[PDB]
Each structure stands twice: as C-alpha cells, then as structure tokens.
Symmetry: D2
Subunit: 332 residues, 4 copies
C-alpha cells in the first residue's frame, strides 16, 4: 500500500545538535520519533550529504550535486524531500525547478529555524508534513514547504530573518495550506503527468550583475557593473518598471545588449509585476534591448539565467526564453 520518500539531508539547522553544531549522522538517529513510523506515513530512506552544505556557502556546483543525487534516486522512490538551511533555500528551490525537465514526482525543499532535536522545534511539523504531502498530495513540481504552506519553489522568498523567519510566495498564492486540514488550492492538480521524460539540465555559475536603481544612479556605476565577464544583468527598477530617463545610462544598457549582455528588468517592490512595452512605462528600456522579467522573484530570475546561459543557446534564444513561462515562475 505505502509510498517511499527519499530525504536528501544536505545541511541546515534542522539537523544540528545544540551547544549549536552540525554532528555526523545525528539526524538519522533522531528520526526514531515514532510519529515518523506510522503505517499512515510513508517509508523514508535518508541520506546525509558528505560534506554537509552550509547554506550561505553554496554555489551552483552544489545545486548540480543535489540535482544529480535526485537524478540517481529518481526511479527508486515516489517522492523527495530536500533538507536545507533557510538562508538560500529559495535560491535552491528556484534553481532546481528549471534544471528538472518533465519532473513527474514531487520534490519538496524544507528545513527549520530550530533544530529538530530542541523542544518545540518547527522542524517537526515541517518534516512530518513535507513527508505526508509528498506521499498523499504529490505535486510534481519543485516546491518549498514552510510556515504551514507549500509554496511554488520559484515563487518563494525569505520574508523575515527574525525570531520568526518565514518565506512567502508574494506573486502566487501557496499551492497548498497545511492547516488542521490540508487544502489544495484551485490552480493545483495532484500528480500531473508530464509530457516527456525526466532529465536533469546541468548548471554552471554565471557572472550576473544585479543592480538596484536609486535616484541619481550614475551611468559610471552601471558601466562598471557591465564590464566583462558579466554576461547578464538584472535591473531592479521602480514600481511597474520605471528606470530614470538619463540618456547615458540608457546608452550604457543599449551597448551592453549589443555586446550580447542580457538585461532583465524586475521591480524592487516585494509584490508587483513589471509592465514594459507601452502605456504604463513607455519604451526607453525596451528600445535599449532590456527585457521584462514580469513578476519574477530575483531568485527565479537568477536561477533562470543560470539555467539558460548554462545551455549552449544563442543570445536571442536566451532572450526569448527568459520571456516565456517555463516552470510557473511568472505570468504574462
């Protein structure tokens, strides 16, 4: 009858022992909490990564590793839970969403503020529900579980870093709420069969410039950010996508695009969509070769350039692809 879920423990506070360190093989020993072993729950095999990943020290090499680990255990399990530290969890859910082509089993990224071995750990409900959702409400996407909500991976962001840290999906509601009862949202289908075959697209680190507009921002600052080896650039603009109108800035952008640098425009407001292309913001930035990133998070936007540039596609394809919806990262 039962399902069997694979737990990749890559790192994060969830598995540490207090007095506050990472400790070899402890997470597997803890998981003698009987609630993990009811017949209602699924079977789990756990793999502690070696070396264990510290979340702020991660790189796309680490993404590749996680990807590959999932690719190797793809056929052997019904679903997957990736334990991971909070700091760059959103970045990892995001990168994985695009690396996985035709994902047809659930992959759930989770973790905790408070190690699983302290009393009142948020890791308990987190792991328990991640396992349960993977088993009884499979959504074949990379998702991110936290705060009693399952959020689409490439839609999530760390909201707070506080006594109460949290993640939100500011431009898409959560796919599912883990309350007293589990409520699938409306736009969600359980166990969507994908078209073709599952494959892991590789990913190598990419020189991306990220740059926040601010009043009077100098074209020399922008210029500098666009020097080799930068192959892409995310502009964080005002409101529904307004940059300042100084000529020499727009010229620095235009020239960048003509050397083959992609320039994406995301808004700097938490919730919000860039509206380029006519009435809302005029044509200055489209004329300079800038493309709209829609309501994309910076995490999504970053992962998605890493994904496309890590292929061997022409400038114009990467460009075109940035602008189609590949894994629910954005609408329009």
């Amino acid at each position: 009858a039962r399902k069997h879920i694979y737990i990749a423990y890559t790192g994060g506070t969830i598995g540490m022992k207090k007095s506050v360190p990472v400790a070899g093989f402890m997470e597997k020993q803890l998981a003698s909490m009987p609630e993990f072993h009811r017949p209602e729950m699924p079977l789990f095999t756990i793999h502690e990564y070696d070396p264990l990943m510290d979340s702020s020290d991660m790189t796309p090499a680490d993404w590749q590793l996680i990807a590959d680990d999932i690719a190797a255990n793809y056929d052997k399990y019904d679903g997957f839970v990736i334990l991971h530290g909070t700091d760059t969890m959103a970045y990892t859910a995001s990168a994985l969403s695009f690396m996985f082509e035709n994902l047809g089993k659930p992959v759930i990224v989770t973790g905790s503020q408070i190690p699983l071995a302290d009393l009142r750990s948020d890791g308990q409900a987190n792991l328990l529900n991640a396992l349960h959702v993977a088993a009884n409400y499979p959504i074949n996407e990379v998702t991110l579980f936290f705060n009693n909500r399952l959020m689409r991976g490439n839609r999530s962001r760390k909201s707070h870093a506080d006594g109460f840290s949290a993640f939100s999906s500011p431009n898409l509601p959560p796919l599912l709420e883990a309350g007293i009862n589990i409520e699938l949202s409306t736009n969600v289908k359980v166990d969507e069969k994908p078209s073709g075959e599952f494959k892991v697209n590789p990913i190598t680190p990419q020189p991306i410039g990220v740059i926040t507009m601010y009043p009077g921002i100098s074209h020399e600052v922008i210029r500098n950010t666009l020097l080799q080896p930068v192959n892409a650039m995310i502009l964080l603009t005002f409101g529904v996508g307004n940059a300042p109108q100084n000529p020499e800035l727009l010229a620095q952008l235009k020239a960048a695009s003509e050397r083959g640098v992609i320039v994406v425009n995301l808004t700097q407001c938490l919730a919000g969509k860039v509206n380029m292309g006519g009435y809302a913001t005029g044509c200055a930035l489209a004329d300079a070769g800038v493309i709209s990133g829609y309501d994309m998070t910076p995490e999504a936007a970053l992962a998605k350039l890493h994904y496309l540039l890590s292929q061997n596609l022409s400038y114009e394809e990467v460009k075109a692809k940035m602008q189609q919806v590949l894994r629910g990262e954005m609408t329009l």
Copy 2:
C-alpha cells in the same frame, strides 16, 4: 488656535488629470476647493505647485535639495508641511529628507495617491485630508510617510506593492493608525521639541554600489562594481547578514575598505537585522547596517558623503542611530 499647513505639490499622479493620466497646470489647487478641506476643524493650507513638476522615477538628489530648500524657506511661516509626491521613489525622498533636516520642530508628511484626486473614489482624498488633519492635530516632528491609512517613519518605509500600491514599515510599527479613530503608537510623542535651531544640510549625488549576493557570486563581478568612482557599497546578504566564506570575495571587500570605500551590510529579507560578530566581514572592514532599509542606508550614505567628512567619521556615524532609522 488655528494651524496653517504648507502643501508642496512636487509631482505625482494625485494632481493629474485623466487621459489616455498626465499633468495639468495648477489643477490640484483649483480642485482642492471642495468643502471638506475648508472647515473650521481643518487647518488652513497653502499650496505651491512645483515648476517643472517632478517625475518620481526621474528624481535625483538635486530634486531632493529643491524640496529641502523649499521647506527651509517656508519653515517659519507654517505649522507643518505636506509634500505631495508620486509613489515610485516616495520612500527614497522621505528617507533623504529625514537626514538633511537637522532639529526638525514641525511635522513633514510626504504623501500621494495612486488615483488622481479628480477621479471618483480617489485614495488621494483621504490621504491629503488625514495628512493635513494629522499635521495639525497630531503633530509628529519627524519626516513621515502616510499611505494606506497609516503614518510611518519616513526612513523606515518601503514601497511594498506595485495594482494596490502599498507602503510598509517592516522593522518599525507605524507611528499612527488613521482608521475610524486616529490611534498613536505607544513609543511615539506628540510635538517633541527640537533642542537646537532647524537647519538644512546639503546633499549631492554619490556613486554608491548596491550589489545583491547570490550563490556562487564571483569576486570579479564584485571587483567590477568596486572600481572607481564608487565610494560606498551596500551589500545585500542572506539571513542575519551571512555572506559566502570564499576568501577571494572577502579579500576584495577588504581591499575596497582599505582604499576608503564604505562597505555596509544589509539583509535581503523584507524584515530582520544584520547581526555581525571572529567575523570575516568585520575583519574585511564591512560594517553592520542592522535593520535599515536599502532606501535608508542609501539616504544616510548620501547625507554623510555629501558633508565634508573623513572616511572614519562617515564610518563611525553610519553605525550610530541618527534619525531613528535603525535599532542596535
């Protein structure tokens, strides 16, 4: 008995007309003659429409300076100031003015609207009304920002949405809540008196780097963003202020701070404090920006870099609370 408020209409969709919305020479002033604003329980107000109007997306520190001077010139003639502004860079202007003003002894409330005043169901109606009434009747002597029925401290505020435009104050409660009854927050005092003479400190554009950290971010792109003429660097890092261990990036921040570039550390998160300690970033000369918003840190750096100060002075003062812009 009666208060008289100065309304500077600097720009912004509130004073605009419907089209297919653009600007129309002195319509706010005519329009602002509907009876609710002329009422013995309201203050008197005078309005000055800026020429040329300012487009919010296109503002510079020289625009900051024009607003700051304009208040300076009218400081002694009014009980308070309301500055109408478009929403796109409202948080920046308000942050900016909080530092330029020294010993502010009268409310300055920056507000605006997402729908022009002339239209049905404008939010600008209630924003201007409560702004005025608050200025007059609940005067907080700071630079403040009023939107979505709340007054926030100006240098704490952040445009958070962009079809229901909202401003939040993520790391500090609103100073005041303007619902059916006006409710002031407990850590807030009315008409706190200034201890010295009110002054405007100038502000000029500074070439500040604002880099966002991401997994595997290369030292070479960081290097590029620290080239001349950059004089200060805001790093947006993860969580409680964690950066990547990698030596080659650290070495590049240290090099930058050693040649006199201010490197400040803020969190990417909508709320939370950087907490630095044995610290890689501290050793490389990076300083904590605690819980400041990006708008605040950017305003503070402009303020300080536009004074005639040494590197160690700017560095020491960026870590002291100057206008309530951060805690710790």
Copy 3:
C-alpha cells in the same frame, strides 16, 4: 447612462448632528457636497422618514413601512439605498430579504458610526460607495454595506460595537469588496434578472423564543420559555449543534413541537454549521438552521409565520434555502 437611486433615510447616526440629536431635513441639506453631484455618480432622490426611526426601538411594523416605501417607489428608480442605524441594521436587512420576492434591483442597507456632518465620517465613503455600487454593480439582493464590503443582508451580523462598529458575514464571503478597486466575489452575479413579478410579502410580530443553552440548564426553565403564545423557538446549542442528552429537557422540546411549536437548532459559535441526522433532537422535532445567523433565523421565521401557513409547511420551508441565507 446615468441611473437614478432612491435614498430612504429611515434613521440613524449618519443623519444627525452632535451635542452634549437628529434634526428634521438636515440630511438632504447635507447631501449637497459636490462629490455627489457629478456625472460619474448616479442621480438621487432622498426621502427622510417622518417620524424618524430609532434603530433599537424598531419593530416588524417598521420593516413593513420600509418594504412598502420601496414598493411604492420600485418602478420609479433604478436601485435603493436604505440609511439606518447600526444597532439592528442586520435584523432589518435580513427581514427585507425575505419580504421582497423577485427583487430585480439592488437594495443596499448602510449607515455610519459618525454623523456625515463631522470630521472624518465613515458615512461619506459608505454613502458614496453604496450609491456607486447600486448604479455600477447592481446586485439584486438586499445587501448590507459597511467597512468597505458589501455583504448579503441575511448573512451579516454586527460583530463589534464600541469605538469601532463593524459588520461581518461570517459564513459567506462578501459579495463585493470596496478597496481602491471594486472586486466582486466569484459566485456573485451582477444584475441577475428575476423570473417573476416583484412583490412584497408582509410581516407581523411573532412570539419567538430564543434559548441559549448552558450546562445544567433546567427543563423547567425551558418549559416556561416555551409557554403560549410562543409559536417558534430558536435554540442556540454548542459546536456542530450539540445539546445535553437530558431526556426531561428533550421531552420538553418534543411536547412543544407536538403542540405546533417550530424549534430550530442554531450553533452558539460565530462561524459554524449545524450538522444533525437516530439523532435525539431530530426525534424531539427540532430542525436544523444549518449555518443561519440568528438574525436570519428570526427574519425567516417572521416571514413564514406571517403567511398563516400550516405547521408542516413552515417546518419544511425552514430547511429550504429561500434567499441565499444558508449553505446546506
């Protein structure tokens, strides 16, 4: 393309002035604030009731008066706004919903906590949006408009009153929300056309007992509350509709129903649906009121008992959804 809306000022704070009262004809004198006399707003005719109704002294006779005034003007106008005092607003609106048959124009009940004539009256918005929503988003129901939401009349309840009066629809989302934008709910239809001639069914006062159940409540107390003339009883029980398993008490209820007393089971919780079937109350004759509000149970009972129908007809129609007042 301009609609014409009838405003019945039945009474309430919205039309008054301050003191340490209401004044004859002040409302209509107030209504000349230019925001109402603009082409994007409907035209209106206001009627002040003489005498003016006090919300807390209302009776089913006052309901009938309101219903007939609306009947008398039904063909003349495009939609109707009823101004009313907050205390029993939800009662009136629930009542009207049943009394009106084949309603084909909107009827919005509203008022305010502060008189329209004072600083920062909520009356302004409520009256502006009521009118605007009747004209531009006509929903052919008796609806109730407060706190920026249009709720179904027979679903609404006054949740707070102190210095922040408020209404909620705890068991049905608002039909329409009035923020900066108007947002309709999904299963709401704009101007749904009715299938027959609009008529008003009459209402008369009925002796309904309400019993709030508590631990140890005595059957003797229950019996006295069921004495003639009571012809119906609303029982407020616990959780999903649970009563004590006390047989003397259960015996008192069955005697009542044996004599022709309709007894309905409602929950004590603000949000909640009764869920009954061998259920001991069903065998006692008690029927389910599902998720009805107390105001809806009462309105529906007056409506049904005022048509002098059989006990079995009243009992059967209580379990049928007549006006969207309950989810089965």
Copy 4:
C-alpha cells in the same frame, strides 16, 4: 529540580480512537508514552483519567464541582494543572472554575483538541505539549485556556468557530500569551503573581438563569415566560452598546422581576464590545428598572459568575454589587 504537572483527562476528543470517535479506557494514558513528553526540559506529569469520562455537551455544574474538587485534592502535590476537556463547553468550564477558585497560586490550563492524539497530525500534541511547557516554565496563576497556539484568560474566552477549523478567541482581552516559534508573553501580564490569601475552592450548584436575546418587536409576553419561577437570574443580550426597545411594558416586567429579587444583567449581543449604561450612551431606562451592566463579559463568564455568586449564601444586593465588581479579570470597568 523539575516541575511536576497534574493532568486531569476529564473527557473530549483528545483521548479517543476512531471507529466505523469512541471513547476508550486508558488510551490517553497509553499514548503519553511518546518520547516528546519525556525529556529533561519537560516537566514530570501524572495523568488521572476520569471515571466516568465526561462528555462536554452534557456537562453540569455538578461536573464543574468534581473538577474543582479534584484540583483541590491535588493542589499541594503538584506545581501546576492541565485539564483536558472536550471543546463544546470548554469555555463554560474554564469560566466557572475561574470564579470557584479563590487565591489561586498555581497555573490551571484547560485544553483539548479537534483531532484525537492518536489520529495523524493531531492538534492535540502541540496543545498538550505547550500547555505542559507553559504551566512549568511560564506559570500564570489563573484559569487559562490554550488553543490555536494562544493562551487566553479562561473567563475571557469563547468558542468562536466550529467546523473543520474550530477555535477560541477572547474578543475583549488580548491573549495572555502566544505559543509560536517563540513563547511570547503579553505586557501587563505577570509570571507567578502570588495571591493574597490561602487557596480555597468555593461551591457551585445549578441555578435557574434565564437568557433573553432581544430582537425587534420582542414581546413582553415571551419575556414574561422567561421570568416565571424558578428563575433567579436573567441575562439580557441587547444591541450595540447596551440598548433595549424601551417599550414601557418591558421596562415594567424587568422592574417587577428585580423588585422580587431577580438579578438582571445586561450584556451586548455584539461579539467584541462593551455595555455602557452610564446615561449618555444608552440613557437610564434600563438602570431605573434595576438592570445592571456586565460591561464586556462573555455570556459564559456571565453565566459562570452568576452561578458562583448565587451559589454562596449571599443577599440579593450583595450578589448585585459583586456582579459589578471585577473578581478575576473577566471584565473591565
């Protein structure tokens, strides 16, 4: 040295097993062999399962006495108390006990769950876990109610929601504490405030209390029925800030009832909100007829407080006076 908490499993879904739901003897006790409850930073605990088990909807003031008496008997053996209880009348119980206990110097936390502990992802485990933790590490010396991750004053509480999503609020008092990722205490709420006299339990017995909900047109004939003997008290649920119909005849009945010793307390039928019979807000019609204000009391605190006072052998006026006095933080003014 660790604390020791006494758990009284009086009844309710938390200690049951599912079936084709049923109560089952000693299962709550069997289950509390879950290692989460047995760790150094948890307090010791002894559980007593009631026999017979109580069903929350059938509860009686006799049942309240039983619970109070059980606590009293165990009062010195332990450092705190958790009462497991079914949700339907959990608020009436918590209320009752607040008045029954006099000079309580030890936490009493009533809690429960929608889902039995044995059922997967029950709310029971967190509710009992933290009730226990809060009792021992954050003792508040009052009768409190723990649900939806918040601890509320027992006599400020009520069951606001019943469904898949059942819940309790104190509409008129902020919760005393919040059990999130971090235990968070309200301000002007003290940990371990010692009382001013020896702990004692005061008796309670059933009282014929009438409860009237005004609606427009409500006839004094139905109100006459509600005042017939044996009724010795009467809760009047009125509109907004405490306003009645002011039909003379109704004034007269209420006056006639108070004149032969029936207590008549005016509460609001609004959820959050407070009765103001000072004179300006509502006038004095109701005051002149002898009705007294229950300010912002819940019905449940109100039924409770009347049962407390009418069960002592106090005079009419004394009960009247005491109903208007704050005895256990149940109201303000």
